[PDB]
Amino acid sequence: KMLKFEIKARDGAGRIGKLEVNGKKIETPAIMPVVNPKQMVVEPKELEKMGFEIIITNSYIIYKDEELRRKALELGIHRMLDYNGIIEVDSGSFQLMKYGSIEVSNREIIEFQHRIGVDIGTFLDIPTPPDAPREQAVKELEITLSRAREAEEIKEIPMNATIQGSTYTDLRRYAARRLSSMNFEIHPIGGVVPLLESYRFRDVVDIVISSKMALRPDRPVHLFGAGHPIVFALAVAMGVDLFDSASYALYAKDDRYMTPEGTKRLDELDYFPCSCPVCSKYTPQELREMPKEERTRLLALHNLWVIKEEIKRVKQAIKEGELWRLVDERARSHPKLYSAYKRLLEHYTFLEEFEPITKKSALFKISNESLRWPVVRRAKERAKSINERFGELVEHPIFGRVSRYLSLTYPFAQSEAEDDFKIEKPTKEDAIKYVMAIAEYQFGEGASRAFDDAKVELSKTGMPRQVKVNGKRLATVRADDGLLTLGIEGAKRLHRVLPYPRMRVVVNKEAEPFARKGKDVFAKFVIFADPGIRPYDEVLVVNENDELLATGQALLSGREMIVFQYGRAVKVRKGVE
């Protein structure tokens, strides 16, 4: 295909990804500034310098304008806007939502998008407003799906296959389920702009998640209209990958000032709570008296900086497994948004499938909501089993009482609350009892049998490290998180002790030789994997005959490993050869 997309880092149902469109590579989450064909508040050439590798414009507005049209047909949007990154373009659907009708056929704008050398296109999907009559939502959804099919047969460039269905979650699941079967590269989530403008974030959350539940996990998700910093953290935590903002410009023309926590009127500002190129050298008292053109141009730039800045913040958060903490923080920005944050944590089932097994950061109890974070409810249940068998419970700030044997392990030992948690180191006689517990906790039921007869080496400190058995190393407890890193010799033991498909990732006959030699496993070569597998889990690489080929760490979840056709499914530690 013409669009590649692979996962590089994650946290929550969120992910930092590498997206390649016909040669142009971009890193997501990304926000594409909306540029107006006529009044370009900020020249595309400048957005380019600022670091925006993807922008978006209106095919329709251009199509309907004498000059714009001739220019686009004459030089293509790229030369016309003098921008060289990814130029996405919209169909006019938004105009179709605002005005109820539009003077162009679904076939016409698609053809036109091709004639002007657009990078990514969009067909005339119908944005059913929120709360609209169920009949209308259904009728309009079929016309949408209808045009989708057409677009699928005439498209020669990458395209947006927008998910509609107004406020009915079953319709979103349907729309997403069907569009995912077709050949489209990116999946926007439409019809939410009205909700965003009404601060009805809880509805946006329900709408987004129902769509994410039914979409193929391997295609980018774009949240149409979401162009205000205030939702970036939350949306990304949900799995949104792309945003488009016109607000940075529209607000500027209205002397309105963006902030990661909301918006402020220029006239209500006494100070500039920012340090961007604009705010670091100008004052509100000054801005206020400058020409309207200079005032807009300046607020525009600032708004873009704030946008660029939160996105950067979100990504750095993901890189350190602290996305939830950031969401929690941004949740205090507004009642409605707090409501939405609480709502998002209810979807534990959805969020748990992708929630990493281990993070670089520590579990911070920084609110009541943090007690409902995915990593907490999961660590709780997996624990029940262990505690009842190993007893010797100890007190825990966050979890309450957790066996002293899981106390050196994430998230229990790698967490902090109001009161410091006192880790309980092993004793020469204890050692193994730990590894057994951890094994049982990390690998599931029965997993301890693979280590019973093992000797545990303790470090200069009372810490479990090398887990050996008459000869070589089975595993090793990681200092950074108290979980086990498998040695080929331990993978073998786990492999025989646990029944297939447990911990397994089945690979191509073609991939086989590579695993054996130790190379990492790429998703496209994965034919099947244990559904229970979560990101960063220890994994048993195997062939269709369940023959151990190598052992490593997963980057995707069992299900993703199957769907994905790009990226690495497994980082391999050691191969059998």
Ligand X SMILES: N#Cc1c[nH]c2nc(N)[nH]c(=O)c12
Residues annotated as part of the active site: 90
Gap between the terminal Cα atoms of the chain: 35
Number of residues in contact with a second copy under rule CB under 8 A = 46
Q: Distances in Å between the alpha carbon of 300 and those of 24, 249, 282?
A: 26, 5, 14
CB atoms within 10 A of CB 192: 23
Which stretch, 99-107, 148-156, 176-184, 271-279, contacts Zn ion (CB under 5 A)? 271-279
DSSP-assigned letter for residue 28: E
279 annotated among ligand-binding-site residues: yes
Strand ranges, E, within 303-439: 363-364, 393-396, 400-403, 415-416
Q: Under a CB-based contact definition with an 8 Å cutoff, are residues 296 and 248 in contact?
A: no
CB 163 to ligand X: min, Å: 9
Closest CB to ligand X among residues 243, 410: 243
Partner touching 342 among Zn ion, Mg ion, a second copy, none, CB below 5 to 8 Å by kind? a second copy
Q: Under a CB-based contact definition with an 8 Å cutoff, are residues 184 and 161 in contact?
A: yes
523 makes contact with Mg ion (CB under 5 A): yes
Q: Distances in Å between the alpha carbon of 257 and those of 288, 360, 516?
A: 12, 35, 57
Angle, CA 291 vertex, CA 289 and CA 294 arms, to 5°? 110
191 annotated among ligand-binding-site residues: yes
Binding mask 273-292 for a second copy (x = CB under 8 A): xxxxx--x------------
Nearest to 112 by CA among 155, 81, 78: 155
Number of residues in contact with Mg ion under rule CB under 5 A = 3
Angle, CA 102 vertex, CA 98 and CA 107 arms, to 5°? 130
532 annotated among ligand-binding-site residues: no
Cα–Cα dist 112/72, whole Å: 10
Return the residue of 57, 106, 113, 162 that touches ligand X, per CB under 6 A. 162
Question: Sign of dihedral through CA atoms 507, 17, 113, 152?
Answer: positive
Query: 290 φ, ψ to 5°?
Result: -85, 160
49 makes contact with a second copy (CB under 8 A): no
526 makes contact with Mg ion (CB under 5 A): yes
276 annotated among ligand-binding-site residues: yes
Cα–Cα dist 221/82, whole Å: 27
| Interacting positions 199-228 with ligand X (CB under 6 A) | 224-225
CB 536 to a second copy: min, Å: 18
| Interacting positions 81-100 with ligand X (CB under 6 A) | 90-91, 93-94
451 makes contact with ligand X (CB under 6 A): no
- Tokens representing 408 are 């050196």
| Interacting positions 488-547 with a second copy (CB under 8 A) | none
140 makes contact with ligand X (CB under 6 A): no
DSSP-assigned letter for residue 520: P
Partner touching 334 among a second copy, ligand X, Mg ion, none, CB below 5 to 8 Å by kind? a second copy
Which stretch, 300-308, 412-420, 449-457, 531-539, contacts Zn ion (CB under 5 A)? 300-308
| Interacting positions 24-43 with Mg ion (CB under 5 A) | none
Partner touching 365 among a second copy, Zn ion, Mg ion, none, CB below 5 to 8 Å by kind? a second copy
279 makes contact with Zn ion (CB under 5 A): yes
Strand partners, 16: 9
Q: Under a CB-based contact definition with an 8 Å cutoff, are residues 534 and 357 in contact?
A: yes
Nearest to 266 by CA among 242, 302, 232, 241: 302
Residue numbers in the known binding site for Zn(2+) are 274, 276, 279
Residue numbers in the known binding site for substrate are 125, 191
Which residue ranges make up the site for ligand X (CB under 6 A)?
Answer: 90-91, 93-94, 122, 125, 127, 162, 190-193, 224-225
Which residue ranges make up the site for Mg ion (CB under 5 A)?
Answer: 523, 526, 562
Which residue ranges make up the site for Zn ion (CB under 5 A)?
Answer: 274, 276, 278-279, 302
Which residue ranges make up the site for a second copy (CB under 8 A)?
Answer: 202, 261, 268-277, 280, 305-306, 308-309, 312-313, 315-317, 319-320, 325, 328-339, 342, 364-368, 416-418
